[PDB]
Amino acid sequence: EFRPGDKVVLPPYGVGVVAGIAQRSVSGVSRAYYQVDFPGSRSKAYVPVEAPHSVGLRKALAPEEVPVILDLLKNGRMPLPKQWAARHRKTSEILADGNPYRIAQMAGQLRAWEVERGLPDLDRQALRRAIHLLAEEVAQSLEITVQEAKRLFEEAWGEELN
Amino acid sequence: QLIHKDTGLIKEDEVFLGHLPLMTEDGSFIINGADRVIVSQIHRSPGV
Amino acid sequence: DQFRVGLARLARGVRERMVMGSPDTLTPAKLVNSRPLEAALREFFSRSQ
């Protein structure tokens, strides 16, 4: 369940607070619907209360989960196919998937490769867009704007952030 | 609003379209920084 | 008239983006377009008699 003021995630919307629940008229009878808003978008969202766990509606990590993610961010890697197709495809799916542990785990190998040989014009967006959801997630949990939030990664990276 | 056919999941998210020229006081728009005018047209009315 | 007939050219630019890529993660923020409409209006306001 999600109360009015719960801090949640709605892929790929990064983070947003739930405003409440309402009966939206969809087709036939109106099932209950959760409401996820994003002030840094001015968008809007309606999430069915039936199976919230099927839309990948997770919740912002707690301040306790910062170090673990950082540790899997600095070191943790993972092999990927050589031809750009499968590799970038996988990375993309992982991105839209909305999984901070997987996005960070990915960011690790992507980082190891970026300063070695160097990152293709594709995997670059697959890195940037990856660090984006992270930097904002940190801003949701620790309530510190993308300035400070991005200032976090600098430690477990070795370099600053864009 | 972009809605899934099966998932029953709703996604609204307002977007952008473009720029639509506005008419002045006198009744003539400004295209490419020039003062132009839209003259009326005439053709037979629809029907049998 | 030019707005609607120009908007249908956008509707087709809608039906080609959704039918591919990632049908799960999509928003109209990626499904719409400017030019099919923008150019449609810019055309009328200049070239028409």
UniProtKB/TrEMBL annotation, chain A:
<dbReference type="InterPro" id="IPR003711">
    <property type="entry name" value="CarD-like/TRCF_RID"/>
</dbReference>
<dbReference type="GO" id="GO:0009303">
    <property type="term" value="P:rRNA transcription"/>
</dbReference>
<dbReference type="InterPro" id="IPR048792">
    <property type="entry name" value="CarD_C"/>
</dbReference>
<protein>
    <submittedName>
        <fullName>CarD-like transcriptional regulator</fullName>
    </submittedName>
</protein>
<dbReference type="InterPro" id="IPR036101">
    <property type="entry name" value="CarD-like/TRCF_RID_sf"/>
</dbReference>
<dbReference type="Pfam" id="PF02559">
    <property type="entry name" value="CarD_TRCF_RID"/>
</dbReference>
<feature type="domain" description="CarD-like/TRCF RNAP-interacting">
    <location>
        <begin position="1"/>
        <end position="111"/>
    </location>
</feature>
<dbReference type="InterPro" id="IPR042215">
    <property type="entry name" value="CarD-like_C"/>
</dbReference>
<dbReference type="InterPro" id="IPR052531">
    <property type="entry name" value="CarD-like_regulator"/>
</dbReference>
<dbReference type="Pfam" id="PF21095">
    <property type="entry name" value="CarD_C"/>
</dbReference>
